[PDB]
Amino acid sequence: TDALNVLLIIVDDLRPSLGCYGDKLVRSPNIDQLASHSLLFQNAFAQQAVAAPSRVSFLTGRRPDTTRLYDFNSYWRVHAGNFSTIPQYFKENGYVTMSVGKVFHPGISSNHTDDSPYSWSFPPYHPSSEKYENTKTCRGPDGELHANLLCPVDVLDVPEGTLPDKQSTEQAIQLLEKMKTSASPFFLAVGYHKPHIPFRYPKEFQKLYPLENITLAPDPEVPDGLPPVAYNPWMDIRQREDVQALNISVPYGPIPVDFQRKIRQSYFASVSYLDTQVGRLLSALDDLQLANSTIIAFTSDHGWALGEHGEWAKYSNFDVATHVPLIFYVPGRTASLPGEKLFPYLDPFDSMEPGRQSMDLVELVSLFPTLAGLAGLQVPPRCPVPSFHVELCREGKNLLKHFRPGNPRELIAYSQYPRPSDIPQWNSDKPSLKDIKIMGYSIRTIDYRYTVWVGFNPDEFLANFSDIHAGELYFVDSDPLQDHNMYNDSQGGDLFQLLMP
Template identity: 75%
Template structure:
């Protein structure tokens, strides 16, 4: 059945944004890099601390969730520019991380699963840490930054992205070990369990180890003559939901609070080492997580609960005044204190933004040359970015101005996508391998609606056929914020609501 005229307009937007001519592309040369200007010195360069959390939706106090105890992240938000509507480009770990760390969309990285390396499969695309490294920064990775395995060449993209070997906590390998003590007194494996740290091999947990290692690296870099780019990837609240037993709240929310304690210790160390005045702090997640919405307890979709993520930037002197001598911006706060103050976030942006904007935004905030927009196709271009720079939101200088920034919300759009092996659910519907992908769902999110078309996809040519539409979804978020009522069939060929303004 034909789409309405306005539906065709919107489908054209999808086509223009996602679909690029794809041909055979040879892997690029692994050249040393793209030095664009003199390497910055410690005196005039800002450091970067990038914190990436796994499977974290916007269930945080600073995003209005009163059920969550996240005082340390909320404290960071109070000194940051916070983006209320930031979206990942695919709601699964490896494709999302490769996408925002290269600044390219999944259709360009050609990664929709966990089983290929973009430098071989698509092109020799530069990454955010690689670009900082090539511009004089010491770049370091702690924990889960790139997804481990084939998707980062079993090396976390070393040596291209990192100055030193990436660090992974030794306790990672015990993820599926029986550490949950049951009523029978025996240890069991479980996706949800509070643990006695004494029952865990090595007597620690991965995120605790990552925090300790990151603080050690900060201590070393305090006396360095070079600026640093430190990426710290936390595993929680990814399943299994394991957290120390003294935190008695169950499952996801308790894991968020446990992760918040680690962020608090890390930021407190930044203060103690007197690096707060010279370090940009960016905080985000690879994607969200459904907690029962649409009958799901997972990611693997285009709905807001799985694609919307927290995103905030602390920039010394721009998002908050520089702290005076002896003043602490990031004092550690125990999430489980009986009395904890509720901190309001700093400036907030309502416009919709995307994680592919991290590359141009971080480089611009650090004073480096912002890589150019990518041409179409861009498989032959090592250094470019498909995301929009968010620097315009940092231009206000009066820190006493209204706390809510509003651009033109009808011009802000975020794109996401998700692959399926078939039109109907089957055993591999959530995580199909590339060879099994037959349908791709391309989603446009505006301030008013989420619109998705499911179209045929050829995994051998990496090509979507937008003339073969299998299904569609349309949700009006003002009246249907949980996106439960699909209006697609109700609007095809008929009059659309007045709020429809593609």
């Protein structure tokens, strides 16, 4: 009798544009193969659609209003409370905990040390080639180097001749080989960068998605019923040279159709590129015969809009920005134990069945208790309200029962996002704490998304639910794309019904 290892794979800005989530265009065979042996959650949502608030949230198992981290300019242990993290908890329980790539968000939000010395057994590994993503590293048709958003590259014509996710993969495999020697179990966090911008990927993956067979988003127009407060102006992508040359109007655009299809091409290519890296990682796991002793959790920190509602990037409460993939492989539980190989590398350039599936509405803040339980450790207790004074507790439910009384909150996935004003402006994507004046709280059920943009006081961290600036109500059955806001024609009977037993 032993304890199970954990391989946690986190992808930056990955929406569920994957074969195992019903996307019949994107080629993600290795992830689909992971899913075929796993439990796939169809309705998983991040608590805030931006890197640091989301990552600090689900790494401490607390919600953004407990971490009080809505930007990326505060360290929770000083700002809110000495909240313990997932890897810290495993390390305290005899695990060797290791971080590769972007797990914590770098900078102050992790105290510049990836939350050292609490979380990791040794200083995390960050791939060196990441620092060239936003340099003049994209060779154009006329032979010059540019800092382009769409950046298909020959690996032999970039600095250091590699890419950050290839480095992360290589280093993760080596650590797995080392741990096969150790007597202790491992908790390995691998944080992949793509499809986060820029779209710098091996140019061969671009051939998988010819532009002729690329369509726009189903709802590329900005909906009439979308209140301006809920619109994000996607300012970060406007700084890239190729984007800047199009002279796209601020803040509503639109992006020229041809470039919209090119963005989707490069995003899909980056996903397939990501998929091969995951393939290499999982295939190495198989060769080392760790498949029968290692939990694999695969998810993302938030989504990314590709023209839906005239939006791009995250910084939103729409499903496209909050809906994330979430897959759990549990040896001998989600699939039969394996010289059998479960994750052989699959080549997307070669032209499966859905594994277990769950439609329950779940939240990234439930990641902490789930992994702790699945690994055989003690599940931290539920948090009180507030829990600033508590170091180890969880505000989300454990999903372990789901692998074989109706509280209304078990029917909800919560999301939120701040705004500095009602009209989209320069900092509406990523407002700093002092500049936050509105907080958009969103409720997502199997039936609808209900959002209210309410007055917010950043000095007291106080929401005023009597100062509603605007509201949104989208119905899954009739309006899955969320194009027809029904909040003005509503009275609140949907919330009442949810409360009534």
